[PDB]
Design a protein around this nucleic acid. Structure first.
Ligand SMILES: [Mg+2]
Length: 476
RNA sequence: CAUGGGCC
RNA sequence: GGCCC
């Protein structure tokens, strides 16, 4: 987005801190090129002479404006896509009762219990439950107050900026390119889950190539459902986006919301409103009060769906912007946020699509750095979706999510205070697809120190997951 | 025990 | 809690 003004206020949101991620016994054995994100602008690991505050807000390269012509084209690609979407899901998007918006419904889980309630609840020393009954299903004073403020759209707000304490590649670590989270006020998140919470639930339960959404899938079983699909087309593309979230032009955002959340589809007149507020946002990074126009507050309710939807419309908008008579069924794709996998028998030319995407402020590049230029012929067994490859299991000829050993070496090398054992269990199910060998090697440094799930146990579990029949039938 | 949403 | 976005 475009930073209109960087003013300095009196208040100051304290975010500075250290990482809770401590090295593990695996570190000294692997020494991965990954490490905790620089949470301090004075961190020695940072290149001598790099303002952490400078990089954090360098993602905003401006809010690309669109010509009425392209706006009409986008509006059509939006209304068109919105047709296929709302067709499958349906038009039962009635406001989710405050109760349902808390406890969650079929598909939509429940609002996190003890998480940053955002502002101004954070400047008054209060927790999430200190304003809402996460045990019951209702809210209190503050909520009901703003709840009535949004009911009349009189409501206004701000976003609290946090430094996502995670593990990242040492290169971007020294580059002070630590990722940040835009924590919005809990009240907002609750209202959004009421306005379109119904919608999201339906999308989650219908993830797939049809609606081009992977939000709600289970890489363990859906990989087999997806793999076959893309391994059916001629060309498979794995596009990448540079600051996908922060580069959503206002015109593309407002048109999308106005097209995908109309009242004719059953949405509440405030569903479109509540979302449009996400355009012009005001961040509160410590003592500074930065204002931005455009982009997406990576950390708001249904933030992934909004991105997934946009990503879907961009592909259609771009293709039509370069070709003629291009319909949805002209190609096939699936995405989870910025991540995306495109496929189409047609020998499309993404390389000549870059500018068309740029007309939206988005910059696409080939996943495979080699010969920076979208080529052709690539199969599903080459692309990487959700940090996972598409490989076949010699044991059952099934498709299974496989993560690069280096990525696994980064995960098993760090962990917070007292979580190793538990983490080993979780991550264990992820390395089961790396094969017996790689598996035993990934947890070798923990033998006798922790309980390591046998490759056997988890393998048989997966088999029953991907296809309950594939397992039982192997008894006859 | 930094967030929205998966998912396990 | 862990991973993914
Ligand atoms: Mg990709």
């Amino acid at each position: 987005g475009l930073i209109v003004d960087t003013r300095d206020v009196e208040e100051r949101v304290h975010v500075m801190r250290k990482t809770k991620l401590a090295p593990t016994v695996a570190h000294g054995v692997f020494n991965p090129e990954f490490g905790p994100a620089a949470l301090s602008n004075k961190d020695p690991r940072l290149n001598e002479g790099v303002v952490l505050d400078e990089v954090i807000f360098s993602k905003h390269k401006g809010d690309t404006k669109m010509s009425a012509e392209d706006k009409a084209l986008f509006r059509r690609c939006a209304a068109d896509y919105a047709s296929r979407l709302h067709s499958v899901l349906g038009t039962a998007n009635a406001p989710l009762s405050i109760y349902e918006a808390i406890k969650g419904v079929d598909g939509l889980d429940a609002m996190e219990p003890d998480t940053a309630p955002g502002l101004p609840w954070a400047l008054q020393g209060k927790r999430r439950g200190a304003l809402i009954d996460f045990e019951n299903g209702t809210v209190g004073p503050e909520v009901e107050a703003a709840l009535k403020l949004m009911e009349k759209r009189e409501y206004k707000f701000a976003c609290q900026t946090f430094l996502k304490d995670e593990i990242r590649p040492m290169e971007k670590v020294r580059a002070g390119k630590t990722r940040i989270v835009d924590v919005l006020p809990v009240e907002h998140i609750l209202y959004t889950r009421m306005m379109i919470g119904r919608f999201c639930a339906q999308m989650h339960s219908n993830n797939g190539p049809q609606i081009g959404s992977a939000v709600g899938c289970n890489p363990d079983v859906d990989w087999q459902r997806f793999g076959t699909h893309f391994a059916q087309y001629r060309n498979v593309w794995d596009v990448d986006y540079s600051a996908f979230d922060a580069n959503h032009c206002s015109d593309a955002m407002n048109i999308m919301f106005e097209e995908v959340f109309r009242t004719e589809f059953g949405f509440h007149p405030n569903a479109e409103w509540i979302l449009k507020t996400l355009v012009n946002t005001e961040h509160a990074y410590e003592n500074k009060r930065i204002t931005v126009e455009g982009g997406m507050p990576s950390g708001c309710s249904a933030t992934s769906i909004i991105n997934t939807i946009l990503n879907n419309i961009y592909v259609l908008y771009a293709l039509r912007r370069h070709y003629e008579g291009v319909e949805l069924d002209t190609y096939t794709m699936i995405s989870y946020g910025d991540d995306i996998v495109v496929a189409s028998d047609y020998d499309l030319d993404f390389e000549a699509l870059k500018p068309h995407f740029k007309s939206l402020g988005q910059t696409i590049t080939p996943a495979d750095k080699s010969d920076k230029g979208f080529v052709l012929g690539h199969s599903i067994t080459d692309v990487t979706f959700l940090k996972r490859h598409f490989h076949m299991d010699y044991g059952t000829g099934f498709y299974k999510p496989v993560m690069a050993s280096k990525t696994l070496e980064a995960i098993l090398s760090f962990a917070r205070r007292g979580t190793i054992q538990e983490k080993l269990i979780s991550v264990a199910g992820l390395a089961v697809h790396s094969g017996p060998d790689e598996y035993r090697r990934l947890f070798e440094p923990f033998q006798g120190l922790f309980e390591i799930p046998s490759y056997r146990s988890l393998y048989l579990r997966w088999v029953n997951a991907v296809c309950g029949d594939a397992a039982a039938l192997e008894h006859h």
